[PDB]
Symmetry: C5
Subunit: 258 residues, 5 copies
């Protein structure tokens, strides 16, 4: 049902935004961090506190109104993580690596994820432990079974609320997202080094094999992210997730559709 | 089979294929039994629930032939989009895992991993290789028959079809590069105690299944076979015991109709 | 606004420079090093010394003024850039902590950041802090009136890289929302044991042209180079750690471009 | 080894398939694919490694169909190796952490195979040409190995005396020899060495990857006296026994080589 | 000025490493590493200091025609020698095998029509270098960053310590160079061999290094990592580098 790209004056636009991370924000002073991790809980008695759980970030961007078809088509995205050099602060609150040494860098398990779509990101739920008791204010797989630990097709959600869908509960659903592009990399392990690139010269092309990008339903663009950079280690040895915001610059064109 | 032109017609099929890590009880779906070792190659009797197995599913397709004469039509697998499902579940460092140190978070899943998928017009063809030819494998497993010391390198007697779900242990079998004329397979083994899992998800990645002559796997008996193994690494309990953790694999296969000579 | 490339005799020029690192320079013998790192300062009492904070390096390169009174502008088309002295890290005999009894010195290793930019105006920078309550020392330029939101994205923290050895690397990143008139490239690798990995070759050129074939255009006849090359931490025999930095070379090809006024 | 005439005629294709066994030392009948436990000399002056402790290059010569009815003709035909598909066989066998392995910690699983590894193959129309290089020129190598003759301290860097054909299976120690880049005009070789005690093995399998054997002029290895030469070394790393002893583990390598008939001057 | 391409020739060289060679039996190794307690008392011994390798390769005299270097094939020689874990090795644990060569490494080559141009940079300007080494003259604290005084030609084999000198990106108009440094005590060596890999030496204008006084210069440094003795002492290990260079005749005026 996709016809010609529409050219003419005002047939192209670009939108930009910064999406803040949602790492748990355990107090008024620790925006961008989670609560300290509390660990070794039997699978039968696993009740994570809300502020310990990083969640997916999401925002809707309104686009100039079109007449109902003409739709905005997302063609490219430029994206990077904002503030990566903040991790060179080894003087603030971090455990000394040895006597007389500097602080321990942020490191360990990390996840870097973004999506651009013409509708909210479609998610599939998978749990480490289907018996986890998730706290009020989170949205997690509803009424999970043992099969929820591998693949349970009942756990479908839209990423339709910021700071609500825990990263550990949800992945982008590859059986859906017909009208979105998503990219993520998970790296797990205690000593994993964060590796992050910035440049204003890199572009991701969002067109499929037929040269069609995401088409923006009701003239709205949806951006999604999760940038868990790794764990911060306090002098006590406690560990907290650290997250950073993500920048998006999306170029769109008008597309004719039936 | 003499392959003629593409019939201009197209369908997509999809499958979420569950991993078969052993499933030691009703609550540990996706995990193996704790890993336990024989002191010796001569007394090596692994329990069934400790052995991850290859996953496989048969996707039935409709017959395309009005007449069972001359030229026939077969379904041809052209592309696959595939992804491991639930990679973010490893960000749960609060459930059951050993502290990395006092007052620290849980130990991440890490260690030896294997990520493998195949798409074929017939069951995956496999070649047996053993770490230890004297391993005594348990009832419910299908493992190399009458193994010899040569079974630890290459014994051409060990040929099998991946013809049963949750029966062929990953440690005993590999895709056979000498066969699989009618399938495409892809795997990476990463070995070691502290190996970081590195997993990517994107709906922009497509594997083309066409060979040098532009022919994909042909569904000879109107069935398509998807095969997987996704051992993500070892989960370490508070106690120090270790268990394999596996994740489901999604498949989306584009098929077209291919004319062939009767 | 942007028109024809002025093609002709005298229409091209190459400029080169070596930009020194600004790692803190704690005394005149330790040029290229920071002061030893402090640690475990509660977030509420974190007052880093100036000499402990590596800063962005920057130079303004004046170009011939092509305008008496349509205008002509210098356009940056390519850059060749290299970190200088990477082999110095093979010196494991100067003041190293031994890796064990009878063993060699501990190499420089750990968190590193390799960054450069070429632009026709100062680099546009965005402030982000590990700890908004950090009290930065005199002679540094850091986010003004920071809040908890400064630990994520706070759009108040916009600055020009307009002073050498003033903008701490830990406080500032290139702003992806600006820098229309510059090209920047950085990689951050974090961790205690990260191996430095550095390449040299005189066969690598970066094209600075955007999609419409236009390079950075030198406003007020100035070319701006910027860098940060934190190689990792040097560990003394005492066990103290210090940032080590190296200089960065730039060779930029420029051409004359016609623009409208 | 299977030699299949895929096509007859001027556009004849022959596919040669084979599985080359590793030669890790095989210290007893039950430990096929392993070396003898590694033992280190105190120093360079009394370094006498045991035969079964030294992995060796694998090689085989595959005879091909005769092409030339008239040995008298102005032109003769040679088999030309155009492509190879290759992979290491049994990589998943390293997921066996239950057999004979050292616990990683109390109550933990077995230690995986890991550490220094070398993955190498060659396809040629004559034996692989090798150059000798030694860690320690004063090593006394055991009966059954072929190692550099009358080595000097210059043998620890480059000694042009140490030239050899890989002309015997399970005889040329991997630690003594490398492919010679000054020769091998009629072979293609590929190898990666990764050193260190915690190095993770990383091995890929696919039936979709083809290496093209043609040079810049579009010419593959030419099989002299109707002979195709395969060579390999696949040291996966070290297996650690419950005792703490370490042995090399090796795996077999599959080859599928596609050959065509090339006319050359008699 | 470079005119038309005029036929072809090939030269090859096995260039030995210069790791220090602390005695007649330890060719390809350095002296054991020692550390000064302090930057003010840093006097390394000559045999402890790996140096750049170089060789001048004489070319057929012509006649202006000049030899132009078009492609190079290069390979580090003897990488499998590191599978010897039986010779003088420290055990990784009780009953375990020997500790492999690992740690900081540098792999570098250059092909030019004249000697390689170098820039000096020091970790420690106050280092006192020994007789037989050529190191930056009148070093200052600026020698730890960029000091434009420190220019040299790689004109002597086994004289210019790797730790004092880099290729000069502001010069070398008539050479191509390539180097990777990987730092850290547990870095694994990763080395590839193949006779299918060629580096083209032509610039964007199609011109390769032109050989002055009918001479070709090859330069290398191949520090593979540290060898650990059973005592726990550590020595650099180096390996030879092969070069095969294809050259064509070029008319100058
Ligand atoms: Cl749900
Ligand atoms: Cl069997
Ligand atoms: Cl500000
Ligand atoms: Cl010899
Ligand atoms: Cl000098």
């Amino acid at each position: 049902e996709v016809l010609e790209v529409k050219t003419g004056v005002d047939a192209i636009t670009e939108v930009e935004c910064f999406l803040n991370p949602e790492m748990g924000d355990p107090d008024e002073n620790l925006r961008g961090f989670s609560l300290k991790l509390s660990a070794a809980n039997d699978f039968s008695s696993d009740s994570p506190e809300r502020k310990m759980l990083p969640c997916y970030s999401t925002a809707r961007i309104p686009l100039p109104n079109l007449n109902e078809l003409l739709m905005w088509e997302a063609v490219t995205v430029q994206t990077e993580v904002i503030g990566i050099t903040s991790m060179l602060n080894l003087h603030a609150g971090s455990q000394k690596v040895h006597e007389h040494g500097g602080g321990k860098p942020i490191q360990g398990s990390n996840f870097h994820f973004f999506a651009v779509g013409g509708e909210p990101l479609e998610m599939q739920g998978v749990l480490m432990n289907y018996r986890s008791k998730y706290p009020d204010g989170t949205i997690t797989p509803k009424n999970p079974t043992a099969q929820s630990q591998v693949m349970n097709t009942d756990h479908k959600a839209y990423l339709d609320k910021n700071n609500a869908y825990p990263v550990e509960c949800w992945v982008p659903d590859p059986s859906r997202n017909e009208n979105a592009r998503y990219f993520g990399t998970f790296t797990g392990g205690e000593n994993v080094p964060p590796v992050l690139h910035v440049t204003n010269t890199a572009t991701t092309v969002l067109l499929d094999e037929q040269g069609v990008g995401p088409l923006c339903k009701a003239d709205s663009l949806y951006v999604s992210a999760a940038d868990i950079c790794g764990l911060f280690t306090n002098s006590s040895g406690t560990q907290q997730w650290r997250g950073l915001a993500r920048y998006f610059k999306i170029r769109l064109r008008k597309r004719s559709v039936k």
